[model samples]
Structures are given as structure tokens and as C-alpha cells.
Target: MEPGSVENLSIVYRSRDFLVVNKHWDVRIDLTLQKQLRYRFPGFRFCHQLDFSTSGALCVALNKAAAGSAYRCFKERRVTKAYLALLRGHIQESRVTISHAIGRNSTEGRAHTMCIEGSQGCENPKPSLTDLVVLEHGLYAGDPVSKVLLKPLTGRTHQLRVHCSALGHPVVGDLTYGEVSGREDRPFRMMLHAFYLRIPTDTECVEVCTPDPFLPSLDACWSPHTLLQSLDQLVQALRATPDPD
Candidate 1:
């Protein structure tokens, strides 16, 4: 895609060392964001990535040292990644932690997707952990829907999505993992959103949050202000919670 063709994304937060923006979900091709940013704004380096169908805060480092520092922060789990998603069914538990082993989907041609290993297990299964908290419960077109706050302790590909589906509640609009009849089921888009990111830089620690684009359509109980507050509260609680040994 041409640099000029890149849609203008909203800048959520920025500094001399880093820049954060609300990621959009339109572009389909792989490395679309990295390529566009490299052409549009030279010298800016990619620090992390969000899924193609996911929307919310993403960070870009201004230089090599900044990129390395940001990358180390994520690698060391100093950065907390939180997401807000609408699941298909009512998640009965208020809080749950999934520590399933995640590996490549062995079913041929499903390399892009990851699957949970059975009890018998496979060799060298990566340990994945995701903490989920049920935020709200509601109905959508006579079917149960739930708003969930997700904190991914391990940065595995599609960790949250796989965990949610394993819980029997695949995210809404998830064409691969969840059931989507047609436009009527997912009139808008995927319900998964990055929502918040907490990162530590050389000089300071930063937290960024963005409103979900489908919030209004997903639930009438949420407004832009309320949504921000809800995310803020979840971040605070998550940070306060002790780490699992």
C-alpha cells in the first residue's frame, strides 16, 4: 500500500522516545502498519504489533535504542497488555485464569491459528497464561453476550482469543474461532480491542488507553467516558494483583 493510502490513525500518546496511536483494523496484508509507518515517517521503528482485526493502542519507537528499550520492557513482562472483548456466551465466573499450553494448530492449512494441547500433551509446549474478568452481562438478539477484561500474561499469538474460545465463548465477530452466521450476527466488526498498554521507558512509565469503536453498538450501558473509566479500573486492579510464581 502507498504511504498516502494509509488512513490517519489517532495519536493517543507520544513522547521524544515513543509514539502511541489507536490501531485501525482495515488493512489486511501482513506488515501493512510497519510498511506504511516506515514510508510515511522515516526513522520510526516498530516496537510491537496488534492483530489484523484488533483495534486499540500500539507503540512505535523513535530510534534504535528506544526500540530496544521498549522491546525489553515487553519481553520482561514489565509492560501490561490489557484487552476488552465481547464474548458470545455469558461467562459465569467473575474471574478466571487459563494456563493452557498453546501450540500451532496441527490441522493442515491452519498454521495461522493456534490450538490448545490436550492432557496427553505434545513436546515443548509453550506455557501460556491469560487472566479474564467478567465485566458485564447482557443480551444480544436474544443470545447471551458478555463483556470481559483480558490480561495476557504471556505474549503468545492469539492467546486471548484461543483462551476465550476454549472457555466456550469465542469472541463476537471472530470468523475463525466463533460462529458467525452472517452480517446479522456481526453487523459491525470483531469485538476484540487492545484497550490498554502500560510500558516502562528509560525516564518514565506510561499507560495508554483507547475507547473501543464498537462499544456503543455492543452495549447500551457503556459511553466513551464510562468505557475509559472501566478500563482504568481494570488496569489498576491488574497492576495491584500479585504476580503468579
Candidate 2:
């Protein structure tokens, strides 16, 4: 999939609170997402992030108030982030909890991949926590692919991607965290997605869920149609909010 194939993107849902889209195997969210949504929306802000290789519900705060609400929710660990990822190999643990602090390395452009550290390191570095559960352990394209559920406790930059890779199960199509060679190792896209996000709609007690946009068929194979559907659905969901006085 080429970068300019904008016509084939899948959008899951979009609203005043955030946008959820299917990030295809080849598309980079930071590069391709904003421009696609810019026509109808301007000055949008990303409250959180997702790996370009991964797909799923990525929330972007449309306004300052939304940003504040999202920040508070995230800070309080009120947001439940679920991810559907294809880990490269099989493991023994059905569920794993990774608590690590991450910081940038002195190396240029390599700050994203650094070693884990203790409490002092966490003072400057960010604390990242992710809970993992294996849904199914199987193979795709002749390579071991473990369909796992990821729950992020602390939202750090590239937290989920790096943690999974650190455990020796790099995402099938990751380009940054692991696998940096050749057509076979480096996927045209990444196999990670933001499968679900459970968060408060506003105050009070209203809660909502944005599900994974990748279809059952598209989960193993990549397609623009799958991505496009996810993108559109996310847009509609986000924009479907009730009018405020």
C-alpha cells in the first residue's frame, strides 16, 4: 500500500471527543491521519497516540475542554484502552502485567527504544504499564502470531509497542519498536491496532466504547476497504454527539 492511497482508508468513528480509524499495514497515522480529517475539521488535537503500524480507536481531543477531560481521565486511569495485537511468537503466560519506566536515549532519533529502569529513572522518564492477555496463539503468513488483548494502565509514548517487543514478541508489522529489515521483516504496515477504548462520554456516569475496526478477515490480511470503513465509522461516531446549549 502506497502512502497516497488515501481513497482506501478505513475510518471507524469520529466525534467531538476523538477519532477512531483503521490504520492499514502501510499507512502512518501521524503522516496520513490529520490531512484526511482536515477538510471538515481544523485545529484538532491528539489527546493520545497510536503506533503508525497499529490500527484501532485513536482518540484526538477536538477542543480544549475535551483535552482537559481526556487528560484528567487518563491521569486518573479511568480510561480503559484495549488493543488487538499480533505478537510474533507464542508464550506461556496467559496474562502479564508490565510495569516499566521509559526515557529517551542520548542517541539521535532512537529515544523511542531504550532500556527499562527503576524509580529514579521514572522521575524524569514516564511510567508505563500494560496488562496483557492472550486471546489466541496461532500463526499467520507462516509466522507465529499471538492475538493478544492489551490493557494500558499508563499511557506513555509507544508504551504498548515497546513493551510487547521487550517481551520478545514484537508486533508482526512493527517498524519502530522491532523488526527493521527487508520486505519480509518490515511489513508494508504494522499489525497493531487500538482495538477498544472505554471512557466517560462526559461527566455524570455516561460511558462509551469504540471497538476495533479491523474485520475478522482483515485481521490477518491487509486491505484498504477495511481501513476505510474503520475511519468513516469513527468519524460518524465522534461527530454524532448531541448538540450542546
Candidate 3:
């Protein structure tokens, strides 16, 4: 990761208590987001984190009180988070929810890595839900690919990647859960982007979104604005739909 990558950080939204940032890929949230932001604003407090390979919106708090409030909101599931992923194969289903039990990838001996586990694999497995909507189908480097809008109802470490991989459509270039084919030594940038977040406050709700980087690859015909607008419309419609249960 380039040290100068911090320069590309943009403030997505700002309030008296908290702020949202548009982050770039490969920058550690602790080392770069929290550290550098706190350096500029001494009172800033780190609230949550996004994976290093993922690029998009992240939330931060300005003070301890705000941090506590935000943290509680996240813990209580008051916040809505959505991600964009470019999957390796064409997803046949228009919309599907993966309700899987996720546990650590014990075989890898990697603390941060996670994988789908069965009843016997996890003693106390947590319920993880990821709603995947296929936005478009296209080709990447002459191979079939699908652009997916992922709404993670339950947050889990590597939830989206693991669920996608388990579905046989891992996010392209995801070396941890999926395969990376091209150059042997070249770095594979994970194609998952945190596109949208809606944070609910006591009096109001704040929504923020970052530009979709893989939009062009998803559809060579659609412009970024066109694709994003369509996605926003779809999200609104999905939210309005009543749950069958």
C-alpha cells in the first residue's frame, strides 16, 4: 500500500457527532483511517472497520460519546450496510438470501479468515444473512461475470466473501476465499466494494454512498451515474417489499 494513498481519502458526510469517509483499497482502517484522521482532528474516535482490500464508505466518530452511540447502534443492528461485488460467474438467480453459519477458517490458521461451517463445525455458530441481488451479467477479460448488490442483514467477518464463495460465485480476485489466475506474483485486488450505508440516529437517518468502481466492467454500456441511479431505485423498491415471514 502506498503511504500517499491516504491523500485520496474524501469525507463522504459529516455531522457534529460523526463522519463518513470514502476510503481507498489496501489502506488499514486502524493505521490509516483512525491514525491519520486523529492526527488531524485530535478528538476523533474510531468506531468500526472495513477490510483492507475493500474500498468504500466507512464511519467514524468525533468524540467518545459519539463513538459509544455509533458503536451501540452497530451492535443493536440499527445500521444498514450494503456492498457491491463482482462475482466470477454469472449468477442465475435475480435475488437470493444466504443464511449460513460462519466460523473461522480453522484449516488456514488465519485469524481474520472465515468460511461457511456446518452444525458440527461450529459449536455456537452465529446466524449470518446476506441478500444478494444480481444487477447485471457481463464478461471480465472474456470470462463470465456478474455484478451483485449485497445487503448484509447480519454483519460477520468475511461474511459476503464466504457466502459468495459457498454459493460458487466468489468475488473476482478474492485470493483468500477464491482463486486468482493471471500472473503468479501479481497482487489480486478483491473486487468487493462497500457501496452504501444508512446510519440511524435518534432524530434522523443519514445515508452515504461511494462511487461504484466496477460499474464499467459490469456493463460497458451504462455510465456510472446511470448504473448507480438504477441501483438506488432497486434498493428503494426492495426496502418497500414486505417480508414473506
Candidate 4:
């Protein structure tokens, strides 16, 4: 009954040092989840950020020590993050790797700042790589779409979106860079989610995940491949096919 209450929060994992959560779609952490979490946990500070429109596994630190520790994990690339996306086309390949350097518009947080490297005005090109595994080829809103898993080998702002766009099949519902214009029945929400993440801690490797939100019950338009019912299965599927040369 309470609209802005902490009871609505979904805790993926919780510990004295850090908290993992499934951030809701279309809400900025600073404006909503962050504020509510702070009210519930006195020293809660977000360790990293997901885009306002993106949803899924996000971590928060209980205090400054944990915050800095989390920061180092990301800085050193020890942390792992992966996403599930509904891209706007049916891709032919089962596994694909995009290892192009991505550049920024230099607007520094302004709109549409990320671009594929080699653009005339793109700046500060950073090496980037994204590996994608096609999960299924299905119709979304009666339009062809591919459900895929994405692993970004290097982190850059909007790396997934920019790379997805470069593939000629941007993430569905992404109006900014996707070919979504004039689609009479485009998806209502951005079909991207931070499905999995793992960060290193002194005592153990902390793995956190969000429930698969793209199932048949969740989205009637798309259906998942039946064999990949769990993470281990997904890993096996990934390794079963060797990485492309």
C-alpha cells in the first residue's frame, strides 16, 4: 500500500559489507532506489551504476570501506557483469564477438554520447569487446527479435548499446540509437537487464543475479530456449561451442 516504501525493494543478496539488488526498470537509483535504500541502511552507497532505463543486478556498499573495495574490483576488471537483451533482429550466428573500440561524443553525460570508434567526431577511443550468445530467435510484438546474452570484456559508457547498434540490431525499445522509429507496435520498456554479476571479496567471490525476467509468463511475445534452464546449462552451452577465431 505504501508507494515509496522500502518493502518494495528486491534484495538479491545482503551482507554487512555489501548489498546486491535487482534495480527496477526506468528508475534512476539516485532518484528512487538509492534514496530508499539509504533510509533503510544508514550508510548505503551505490558501488556502480546501471542506466536509468536498464534493470537488474546492482550492488551497494554498506560503508566507505566496502565502497572503495568494490570500486577496486571494477577498476581491476575482477568484477563480472553480463546482460540479457532483446535485439531488434534475428541474428544468424549462434555466438558473436564484437571487439571494436568505442568512442565518446565528449559531451560528458549529455545525450547520445557513446559512438562506435572511427567516427569523424568520436573522441577518446577506448578498447572494447562484447561477446554475445544467441539464446533464441523469436517474434516480439510480432516483429523479429533475438534474445541474446552479452558479455562486455571491457567497460565503457553505453558500450552495450553502442555495440548492439553497430551490429545492425540495437537493443529493442531503445529509441536513441536503435532502429525503432515508425514501428507501430514497439516494445513498451527497454528489453535489457543486468542478469548476472560477480565481485571478489576477501573471504569469498560474491555472485549475485536477478531472476530471468524475459520468460514466457513475463513477456508473452518472446520465449526462451528450453535447454538453458540454469546458469550451469548456459555455461555449458557457451563452452560447447568454441570461441570464434
In order of appearance, the predictions have TM-scores of 0.81, 0.69, 0.82, 0.85
Model 3 is weakest, by summed lDDT over 10 consecutive residues, at 220-229
Model 4, 1-245: lDDT tens digits are: 11234546778998888788888777687758877576665667787899877888999887787888888788777777789988887888888899879988765436577888776678988989999888877778777788888988888888898898898888888866676362624676788899878878555455766787877787786754433224557754534443222
Better of 2 and 4 by TM-score: 4
Clashes of 3: 0
Residue-wise C-alpha lDDT for candidate 2, range 57-140, written one tens digit per residue: 666676788778777766666666567676777756877898867665445335345544542233356777888876666665
lDDT of 1 by residue, 1-245 (tens): 11224645467888888888777655432547666565556576667878787777888888788888888887777787789887777777788999988876656325336777772323345889998888777654455777788888898888888888878888877766674442324435667888878787676565787775545564553333212125557777866755333
Instruction: Specify the highest-lDDT model's number.
Output: 4
* Per-residue lDDT of model 3, residues 92-182, tens digit only: 7788889988876555636336767772334345789999988877766556778889988888888998899889898777767775462
- Lowest-scoring 10 consecutive residues by lDDT in candidate 2? 222-231
* Full-model lDDT for every candidate: 0.70, 0.60, 0.72, 0.76
Q: Model 4 residue 92 lDDT?
A: 86
The clash number for model 2 is: 30
Task: Please report the TM-score between candidate 4 and the true structure.
Answer: 0.85
Give lDDT: candidate 4, residue 55. 85
TM-score attained by model 3: 0.82
Judged by whole-model lDDT over C-alpha atoms, candidate 3 comes out at 0.72
Cα-based RMSD of candidate 2: 7.7
Q: Order candidates by lDDT, high to low.
A: 4, 3, 1, 2
For model 2, the superposed segments whose C-alpha errors exceed 4 Å read 1-4, 8-11, 14-19, 23-31, 40-42, 107-112, 118-125, 179-186, 201-216, 219-245
- Quantify how close model 4 is to the true structure by its C-alpha RMSD in Å: 4.3
Judged by whole-model lDDT over C-alpha atoms, candidate 1 comes out at 0.70
